[PDB]
C-alpha cells in the first residue's frame, strides 16, 4: 500500500491514487484509469497505458513493480497513452 | 338649436345632445341614438324609440315638436324602447 | 439627564390668553376659526391622543426621508418603470397628477387650523400637519420627476391641477370644498376625520401593497412612508367632534360628517375603484373594490361614529348598494372618454377578467357586460371609431363627475335634477343634490365643464376645442393601456 | 465658526515621541512593526493621500448604514431570494461563507498597523480601517442571516471558516499568510496594496453590477456600500512602499508584492473566476473573467508599480497565459467535487454556453470541452455516479487548491514538486513553489487536507470520513445548481 499522484493524460487534474508495492506498472495504470477513463477521459482501446515519473520523464516498463521503481511516497506519475 | 340631456335606455351614462327646436320626438330620438346605438347599446329593430321627460315620466308623442314640449334648456330626457 | 415627555408636554400647548389690545373675534374671526359659540375655555378640553414634540419630529422624519430617498437612488438605474405593466404605470400617472399638488395645498388647510383654532392642542398638531403635507407634496414631485424623460404624461405630476382637464376640476372641487374654503374646526372634521382617517389612511396602505405586488419597490416605499405620517395629523377631527357633541352642536357636527363622507366617496369611486378592479392585472387582485370598501373603510366609519356619539349618515344604505355600481360607471366613463385624461386607461374586460368581475359582482355581465360586448364587437370588427365619443357626458354639479349608473338588462341611470333661481342643475345621486340644497350659496354660480361648453366659454365650441381648453394634446391624451392587446382573445 | 480640515489635520497624526521608560524596540517589536532598520523620523514622511477625521467618519458612515439597512427592510418581504436564478443564490452562499469572517478578521490585521506602525499617519488610518472591517464583517452576517430559514447553507455565512471544509482552509491559508501573521508594514503592503487595492476593490464593483443584473437589489446595495469604504484603508500600502524604495529596501518591497499578488490571484481564480464564467446566466455576461482581469486588474497593477518605482513580477507573462486556463480548472474541480462545498455549483456547459465559452476562449471545446463531453454523455446515458469522485485531488501546498490545468487535445497539467527536509511537497504552479522556497520556515509543517488524509488524521479514512471531518452533511453538501436541467438539451 503506497500513495501516488496520478496525472492522467488528457485529464485536467492530478489525483491521489493508492496502489500496492506489489503492483506492476500495468496495474498502477489500471488503478489510475478507474479515476479518469469514462469520467473525464475517453477510452483509447487502440492504445497502451504507460507509466512515467512526472519529475524527470523516466518511462517505466509495463512489467516493473512499484517496490522496484524507487518512488517517494506520494510521487507524481504521468499515465500516458502509447503503443 | 337646443341642449338636452339624453339618458338612453340600457346605456350607463347621460349625455349632452344638441337638438333643434323644430325636431320631432322621433328626430330627437335619432339624434340621441347616434351617441348610444352601436357604441354601447344593441339595436332593437323590432322596437320604437320613444321620448319621455326624465323628471316626471311624461311620454311625448312621436310627432310632437321640441318647441311645443316646454322643456328647460338642458332638460334630461329618457330615450326608451317601445312598440 | 432628560425629562420624560409626559412631565412637560402640557406646557407646549398652554398658549391661550385673553386678548386686550384687539378683541377675541378680531383675533379669531368666526369665518376662519369656526368656534361656533363655544368658549375659549371649552376649546381647551381638546386632547389629541397621539402626542409628539419638535425634537422627536425632526429626528424621526429625517430617518424616514433617509430611507425613502435611499431606496429611490438604489433602484433608479434598473429602470423598473420601462418594463412595468402598463395598467400599473397608468395607476402611478393618475395618482401623482391628482394628488401631488393637493397634498401641498393640504399644508395650507393645516396652516388654517394652526392659526385659527381656539384649541391650543389643535394649533400645534396642525403645525406638524403643515410640515407633513409639505413633505408629501414635495416627495410626490421629486419621485415622478425621475420619469419626465420617459413621457410628457409625467409632467402632469405638476401640471394637472393647473389645468381645466375634467378630472382636475373634480379634484379641486373636492379639495377646495373640504379643506381650502372652510373654518378651522370644519377643516378638522371634514378633512382630517372624514377624508384622511376615513379613506386615505387605508387607501395608502392598499396602494403600497399593490405597488409591491407589481414589483415596484420605489413606489411601494414612497407610499408606505407617506402613510406613516397620516395618523399624527389625521387624529385632529376626532377631539373637535367630541367638543361639538358635548356642547350644543351634534347636528352641525353630524351634517359636516355627512357631507365630507359622501364627497370623499365620490372622488374615491373614480380614483381608486377603477384602478383596483381593472388596471391591476388579474393575478394581483387580492380583494374587490367593494370588498376593500366594506372591510377597510365602512366598518371603521361605523365604529368611529358610534364612539363619537354620532349616527350613520341618512344615505348609508344607498352608499352600500352603490359599491356594486358607481365605480364600474366611473371606469367605463374614463375608458370610453380616454383621450380626455392624462393616463392610459386599461379596459380590463378580457374573458378571465370578466369571470373575475362576475364572481365579485353577480349581475355584471348582464348589466356592465352589455356595453363592453358592443365596444368589443366594434373592435373585433374594425370599427374603433365607435369606441371614442363625439359628445360630452352630463357632469354632476356637485362632484363634477359624469352621471352614470347601471346599464344593460337592469338599466337604472337617474338624474337628480334641481331648478334653483332660474338655473337647472344636474346631480349624480340623491346625496350629491342634498349637499347643494343644504348650502346652495357655496355652490350656486360654479359652472361645470358642460355648463362652460354650453355658455360659449370653450372656443372653438367643439371636441378639439374642449381638448385645447383642458390643455390636452397628443402625447398626453389617453388611450387603451395595453394598446388593444386584449381584443385578440375575441379575434 | 469651524476650522477647515487642512488647517489642523496634521496635529491628529503628530503623535510620535521618543520613549524613555522602555526602549523603542520594546515598544515597537520588529516582528510586529517591521520598521526594517528605517528610523522613526523617516517613517514620519508617510502621507496618506485620502484624509478623514473622526466626526466626518461617524457622520458619513451612519448615512451609509441608514441606506443599506433601509433597502434591506424595504425588500425583505418580497423574498427575491426564493425566485432567484440558482447560479446566483449559489454565488451569494459562496461569497458570504468565504468572506464574512475574513472581513472581521481583517479588523485585527488593521489593529496590527494601528498599534505597531511607526508612521503616525498609518496608525490613525488603520484605526478607521479597523472600524471599516468591523462593519464589513457585521453587515455580511446580518444580511445572510435573513435567509437561515430557507436553507442550512446560509448558516455557513458564519460556520465556514470554523470548519476544515477544503475551501475554508484555502481561504485561511491566504488570509493568515497575508494579514494575520505579518509585521505591520508587511500587512500594509500585502493586504491593503496588493489584495484590497489590487483585486477586491474592482471585484466588489463587478460583484455589485452583477447583483443588479440579476435583479438582486438588496445584495447590490450591500456590496456597493461596502465598496465605498475600501479606498479609505486600501490606500495604506502605497506610502509604505514609497518609504521602502526611498530607503535601502526596494527588493524586500518587490518580493512582498510578488508574493501577495500571486496568492491573491490563486484565491481569485476559484472564488470569482468560476462564478463569472459559469454561474451567471448567459444573457447577463458582460465580459469574460479574462477580459475583466485584463481591463480592470492587470493594467492597474502595471500602472501602480511603475509609479511606485517597482517592476512587474518575474511571473507576469505566465500570469497572463493562465487567465485562459486556471479558473476553468477551478470550476471543473469545484463542480466535479461538488459535494465537498457548501453551495450548489452551476455546470454552465449548455450548447449556447459552450459557444460563448469558445468565443471568449478559443480552444476551449477542444481542451476543457472534452471532459465535459464525457461528463455529459454519462448524464445523458443514466450513469450519474461517474460524475462524482471516489478519490481526493492532489492539493497544492501553498494555495491549498487542486492542481489542475489544461486537458484534452492540448493536455498540459504539471506538478511543481519539491523535496525539502525529507518531505515531498506538491505545487500548483511555479510561483506557488517559489513562495515556499523564499520562506520555507513559514510553511514547512503545515499540512494540506491530502497530507492529513495520508497521515491518518481523517478517520474513518474514506470519503464519508473526510466529509465528516469537513463538517459536511446532506442539506449543505453541494450538488448541480439547476438540478441537471441543462442535460435535456443533449437528451
Amino acid at each position: 500500500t503506497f500513495p501516488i499522484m496520478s496525472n492522467f493524460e488528457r485529464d485536467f487534474v492530478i489525483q491521489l491514487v493508492p496502489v500496492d508495492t506489489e503492483d506492476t506498472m500495468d496495474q498502477v495504470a489500471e488503478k489510475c484509469a478507474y479515476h479518469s477513463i469514462n469520467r473525464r477521459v475517453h477510452p483509447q482501446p487502440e492504445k497502451i497505458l504507460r507509466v512515467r515519473r512526472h519529475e524527470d520523464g523516466t518511462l517505466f516498463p509495463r512489467g516493473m513493480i512499484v517496490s522496484d521503481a524507487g518512488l517517494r511516497p506520494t510521487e507524481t506519475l504521468d499515465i500516458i497513452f502509447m503503443d | 338649436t337646443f341642449p338636452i340631456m339624453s339618458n338612453f335606455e340600457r346605456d350607463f351614462v347621460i349625455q349632452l345632445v344638441p337638438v333643434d327646436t323644430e325636431d320631432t320626438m322621433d328626430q330627437v330620438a335619432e339624434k340621441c341614438a347616434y351617441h348610444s346605438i352601436n357604441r354601447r347599446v344593441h339595436p332593437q329593430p323590432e322596437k320604437i324609440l320613444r321620448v319621455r321627460r326624465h323628471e316626471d315620466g311624461t311620454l311625448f308623442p312621436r310627432g310632437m315638436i321640441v318647441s311645443d314640449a316646454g322643456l328647460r334648456p338642458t332638460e334630461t330626457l329618457d330615450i326608451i324602447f317601445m312598440d | 439627564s432628560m425629562l420624560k415627555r409626559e412631565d412637560w408636554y402640557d406646557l407646549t400647548r398652554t398658549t391661550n390668553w385673553t386678548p386686550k389690545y384687539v378683541t377675541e373675534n378680531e383675533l379669531f374671526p368666526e369665518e376662519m376659526s369656526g368656534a361656533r359659540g363655544i368658549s375659549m375655555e371649552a376649546w381647551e378640553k381638546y386632547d389629541e391622543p397621539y402626542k409628539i414634540t419638535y425634537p422627536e419630529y425632526v429626528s424621526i422624519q429625517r430617518e424616514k426621508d433617509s430611507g425613502a430617498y435611499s431606496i429611490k437612488a438604489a433602484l433608479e438605474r434598473d429602470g423598473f418603470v420601462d418594463r412595468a405593466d402598463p395598467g400599473w404605470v397608468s395607476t402611478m400617472q393618475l395618482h401623482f397628477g391628482a394628488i401631488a399638488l393637493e397634498e401641498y395645498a393640504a399644508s395650507t388647510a393645516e396652516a388654517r387650523m394652526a392659526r385659527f383654532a381656539k384649541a391650543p392642542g389643535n394649533r400645534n398638531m396642525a403645525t406638524f400637519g403643515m410640515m407633513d403635507e409639505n413633505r408629501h407634496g414635495q416627495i410626490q414631485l421629486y419621485f415622478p420627476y425621475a420619469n419626465v424623460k420617459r413621457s410628457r404624461k409625467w409632467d402632469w405630476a405638476h401640471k394637472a391641477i393647473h389645468t381645466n382637464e375634467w378630472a382636475a376640476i373634480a379634484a379641486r372641487s373636492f379639495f377646495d370644498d373640504m379643506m381650502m374654503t372652510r373654518d378651522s374646526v370644519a377643516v378638522s372634521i371634514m378633512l382630517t376625520f372624514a377624508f384622511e382617517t376615513g379613506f386615505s389612511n387605508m387607501q395608502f396602505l392598499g396602494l403600497a401593497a399593490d405597488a409591491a405586488e407589481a414589483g415596484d419597490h420605489t413606489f411601494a416605499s414612497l407610499i408606505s412612508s407617506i402613510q406613516t405620517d397620516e395618523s399624527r395629523h389625521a387624529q385632529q377631527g376626532g377631539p373637535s367632534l367630541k367638543i361639538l357633541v358635548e356642547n350644543g352642536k351634534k347636528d352641525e357636527a353630524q351634517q359636516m360628517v355627512d357631507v365630507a363622507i359622501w364627497r370623499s366617496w365620490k372622488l374615491f369611486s373614480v380614483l381608486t375603484g377603477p384602478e383596483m378592479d381593472y388596471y391591476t392585472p388579474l393575478e394581483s387582485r387580492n380583494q374587490s373594490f367593494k370588498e376593500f370598501m366594506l372591510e377597510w373603510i365602512v366598518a371603521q366609519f361605523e365604529r368611529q361614529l358610534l364612539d363619537l356619539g354620532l349616527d350613520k349618515p341618512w344615505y348609508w344604505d344607498q352608499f352600500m348598494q352603490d359599491l356594486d355600481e358607481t365605480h364600474h360607471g366611473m371606469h367605463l366613463g374614463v375608458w370610453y372618454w380616454r383621450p380626455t385624461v392624462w393616463w392610459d386607461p386599461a379596459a380590463g374586460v378580457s374573458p378571465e377578467e370578466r369571470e373575475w368581475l362576475e364572481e365579485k359582482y353577480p349581475g355584471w355581465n348582464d348589466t356592465w357586460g352589455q356595453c363592453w360586448d358592443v365596444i368589443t364587437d366594434n373592435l373585433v370588427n374594425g370599427k374603433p371609431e365607435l369606441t371614442v365619443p363625439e359628445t360630452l357626458p352630463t357632469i354632476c354639479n356637485m362632484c363634477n363627475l359624469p352621471i352614470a349608473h347601471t346599464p344593460g338588462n337592469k338599466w337604472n341611470v337617474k338624474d337628480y335634477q334641481l331648478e334653483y333661481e332660474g338655473r337647472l342643475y344636474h346631480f349624480g345621486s340623491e346625496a350629491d343634490r342634498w349637499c347643494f340644497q343644504i348650502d346652495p350659496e357655496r355652490y350656486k354660480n360654479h359652472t361645470n365643464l358642460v355648463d362652460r361648453f354650453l355658455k360659449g366659454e370653450i372656443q372653438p365650441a367643439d371636441l378639439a376645442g374642449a381638448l385645447m381648453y383642458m390643455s390636452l394634446e397628443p402625447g398626453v391624451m389617453g388611450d387603451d393601456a395595453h394598446d388593444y392587446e386584449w381584443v385578440k382573445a375575441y379575434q | 465658526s469651524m476650522l477647515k480640515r487642512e488647517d489642523w489635520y496634521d496635529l491628529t497624526r503628530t503623535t510620535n515621541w521618543t520613549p524613555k521608560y522602555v526602549t523603542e524596540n520594546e515598544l515597537f517589536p520588529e516582528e510586529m512593526s517591521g520598521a526594517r532598520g528605517i528610523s522613526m523620523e523617516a517613517w514620519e514622511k508617510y502621507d496618506e493621500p485620502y484624509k478623514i477625521t473622526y466626526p466626518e467618519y461617524v457622520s458619513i458612515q451612519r448615512e451609509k448604514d441608514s441606506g443599506a439597512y433601509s433597502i434591506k427592510a424595504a425588500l425583505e418581504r418580497d423574498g427575491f431570494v426564493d425566485r432567484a436564478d440558482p447560479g446566483w443564490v449559489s454565488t451569494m452562499q459562496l461569497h458570504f461563507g468565504a468572506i464574512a469572517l475574513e472581513e472581521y478578521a481583517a479588523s485585527t490585521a488593521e489593529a496590527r498597523m494601528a498599534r505597531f506602525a511607526k508612521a503616525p499617519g498609518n496608525r490613525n488610518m488603520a484605526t478607521f480601517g479597523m472600524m471599516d472591517e468591523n462593519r464589513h464583517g457585521q453587515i455580511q452576517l446580518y444580511f445572510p442571516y435573513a435567509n437561515v430559514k430557507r436553507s442550512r447553507k446560509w448558516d455557513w455565512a458564519h460556520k465556514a471558516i470554523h470548519t476544515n471544509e477544503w475551501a475554508a482552509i484555502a481561504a485561511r491559508s491566504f488570509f493568515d499568510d497575508m494579514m494575520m501573521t505579518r509585521d505591520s508594514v508587511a500587512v500594509s503592503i500585502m493586504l491593503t496594496f496588493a489584495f484590497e487595492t489590487g483585486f477586491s476593490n474592482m471585484q466588489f464593483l463587478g460583484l455589485a453590477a452583477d447583483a443588479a443584473e440579476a435583479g438582486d437589489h438588496t445584495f447590490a446595495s450591500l456590496i456597493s456600500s461596502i465598496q465605498t469604504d475600501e479606498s479609505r484603508h486600501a490606500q495604506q500600502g502605497g506610502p509604505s512602499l514609497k518609504i521602502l524604495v526611498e530607503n535601502g529596501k526596494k527588493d524586500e518591497a518587490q518580493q512582498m508584492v510578488d508574493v501577495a499578488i500571486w496568492r491573491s490571484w490563486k484565491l481569485f481564480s476559484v472564488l470569482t473566476g468560476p462564478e463569472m464564467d459559469y454561474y451567471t446566466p448567459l444573457e447577463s455576461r458582460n465580459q469574460s473573467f479574462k477580459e475583466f482581469m485584463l481591463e480592470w486588474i492587470v493594467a492597474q497593477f502595471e500602472r501602480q508599480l511603475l509609479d511606485l518605482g517597482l517592476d512587474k513580477p518575474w511571473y507576469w507573462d505566465q500570469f497572463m497565459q493562465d487567465l485562459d486556463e486556471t479558473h476553468h480548472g477551478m470550476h471543473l474541480g469545484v463542480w466535479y467535487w461538488r459535494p465537498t462545498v457548501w453551495w450548489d455549483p452551476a455546470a454552465g456547459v449548455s450548447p449556447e454556453e459552450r459557444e460563448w465559452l469558445e468565443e471568449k476562449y478559443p480552444g476551449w471545446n477542444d481542451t476543457w470541452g472534452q471532459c465535459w463531453d464525457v461528463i455529459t454523455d454519462n448524464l445523458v446515458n443514466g450513469k450519474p455516479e461517474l460524475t462524482v469522485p471516489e478519490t481526493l485531488p492532489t492539493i497544492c501546498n501553498m494555495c491549498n487548491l487542486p492542481i489542475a490545468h489544461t486537458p484534452g487535445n492540448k493536455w498540459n497539467v504539471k506538478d511543481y514538486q519539491l523535496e525539502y527536509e525529507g518531505r515531498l511537497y506538491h505545487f500548483g504552479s511555479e510561483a506557488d513553489r517559489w513562495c515556499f522556497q523564499i520562506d520555507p520556515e513559514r510553511y514547512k509543517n503545515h499540512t494540506n487536507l491530502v497530507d492529513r488524509f495520508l497521515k491518518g488524521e481523517i478517520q474513518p479514512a474514506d470519503l464519508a470520513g473526510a466529509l465528516m471531518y469537513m463538517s459536511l452533511e446532506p442539506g449543505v453538501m453541494g450538488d448541480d445548481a439547476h438540478d441537471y436541467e441543462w442535460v435535456k438539451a443533449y437528451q
Binding site: - | - | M2, L3, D7, W8, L11, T12, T14, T15, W17, T18, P19, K20, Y21, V22, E26, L27, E31, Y54, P55, V58, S59, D65, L101, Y104, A105, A111, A114, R115, R123, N124, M130, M131, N134, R135, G137, Q138, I139, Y142, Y145, V148, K149, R152, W154, H158, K159, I161, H162, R172, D176, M180, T181, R182, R442, Y443, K444, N445, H446, E473, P474, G475 | -
Partner: protein, 322 residues
C-alpha cells in the same frame, strides 16, 4: 405628439439643470390661476372674498411672484437634516448641563429674573408661530409660503425649548410658580405689555404684504434683539450658561428668517412704488416695536443701554435691505 422634456415644463427655459429645490418648490399654488375665482366653488364664498382682498389686492405688487427663491434653498428633507443636528446640539446642552446641576448654581435673583423675563417667553413665541403660519396661507407664491412654513416650525421649536426648560426650572424651584404664573405675567406685567400689544395687533393684519412686514420685518427683529440678544448676554453675564447658549442657538434660526425676508424685499424693490409701500407699513408699525423694546428692556438690569442697543440692532436689519 408632444415630446418628453428634460425637466418640468414650467422650468424648461433655464440653461442650468434645475435643483431639487426648484423641482419640489416652484409654481405650486393653484388658487392664483383664477384671480376672479380662486377656489373651485361659488365665487362669493367668504374665503373667495378673503383671498381676493388680502392676497390679490395687496399694494405690494409683482408680475411674477413665483420667481422668488429662498436664498437658503430649504426643502423639507434638508430642513430636517439641519434642524436635527441643531437639536442634537441643544438637547446635548440640556442633557449634560443638567447632569452637572447647572440649575442648582443659579442665584435666587437670577431665578426671579427667569420667571419674569424668560419662561414668559412661551406666549410670545407661540404668537410668532401663529404669525408666520398666517403668512404661509396667504402669500402669493409657493416659494414664499415655504419659507414661512419652515419659519413656523422654528417658532414652535423655540416655544418647545421654553416649555421644556420651564418644567426643569419648576422642578428645581417649586415655590417660584414656573409654569403656573406665565399667563398672568404676559397678561399684566408692564414689561410685557409693549410686546403683547405689538403682537396682538400684528396678528390681525390680514394683507399678505402687511403681515410679512409687521411680523417679519418689524416685530421679529424687536423680539429677537430683546429676548435673544439682550436677555442672553445678560444670562451669560449672570451665570446662566444654558440660556446664554440656548438663545444664541435660536438666533441661528432668526438669522435665516432674516435672509429670506431680505431676499423678498430685494425682489419687491424691482418694481416701482414697492419701497414706499413697505416704508409706509414699517412707519405704521415701528412705533409699536419701540414701545415693546422700551417696556421690556427698561425693566432689565442696565435697562437704558439694552434699549439703545436693541433699538439700533433691529433698525439695522431693515436699513440693510434698503
Amino acid at each position: 405628439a408632444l415630446k418628453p422634456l428634460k425637466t418640468w415644463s414650467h422650468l424648461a427655459g433655464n440653461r442650468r439643470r434645475p435643483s431639487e429645490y426648484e423641482v419640489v418648490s416652484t409654481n405650486l399654488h393653484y388658487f392664483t390661476d383664477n384671480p376672479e375665482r380662486p377656489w373651485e366653488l361659488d365665487s362669493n364664498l367668504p374665503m373667495q372674498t378673503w383671498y381676493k382682498k388680502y392676497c390679490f389686492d395687496s399694494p405690494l405688487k409683482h408680475d411674477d411672484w413665483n420667481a422668488f427663491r429662498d436664498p437658503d434653498q430649504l426643502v423639507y428633507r434638508t430642513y430636517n437634516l439641519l434642524q436635527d443636528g441643531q437639536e442634537s446640539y441643544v438637547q446635548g446642552l440640556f442633557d449634560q448641563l443638567n447632569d452637572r446641576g447647572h440649575d442648582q448654581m443659579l442665584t435666587r435673583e437670577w431665578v426671579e429674573t427667569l420667571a419674569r423675563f424668560y419662561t414668559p417667553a412661551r406666549y410670545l413665541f407661540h404668537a410668532l408661530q401663529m404669525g408666520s403660519v398666517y403668512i404661509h396661507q396667504i402669500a402669493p407664491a409657493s416659494t414664499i409660503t415655504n419659507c414661512a412654513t419652515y419659519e413656523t416650525a422654528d417658532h414652535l421649536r423655540w416655544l418647545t425649548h421654553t416649555a421644556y426648560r420651564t418644567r426643569e426650572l419648576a422642578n428645581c424651584y417649586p415655590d417660584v410658580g414656573f409654569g403656573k404664573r406665565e399667563r398672568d405675567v404676559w397678561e399684566n406685567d408692564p414689561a410685557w405689555q409693549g410686546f403683547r400689544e405689538l403682537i396682538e395687533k400684528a396678528l390681525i393684519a390680514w394683507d399678505w404684504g402687511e403681515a410679512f412686514t409687521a411680523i417679519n420685518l418689524v416685530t421679529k427683529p424687536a423680539v429677537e434683539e430683546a429676548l435673544l440678544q439682550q436677555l442672553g448676554s445678560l444670562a451669560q453675564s449672570e451665570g446662566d450658561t444654558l440660556l446664554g447658549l440656548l438663545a444664541q442657538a435660536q438666533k441661528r434660526d432668526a438669522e435665516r428668517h432674516r435672509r429670506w425676508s431680505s431676499a423678498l424685499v430685494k425682489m419687491a424693490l424691482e418694481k416701482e412704488g414697492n419701497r414706499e409701500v413697505l416704508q409706509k407699513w414699517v412707519a405704521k408699525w415701528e412705533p409699536l416695536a419701540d414701545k415693546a423694546i422700551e417696556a421690556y428692556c427698561s425693566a432689565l438690569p442696565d435697562g437704558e443701554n439694552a434699549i439703545v442697543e436693541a433699538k439700533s440692532a433691529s433698525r439695522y436689519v431693515r436699513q440693510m435691505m434698503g
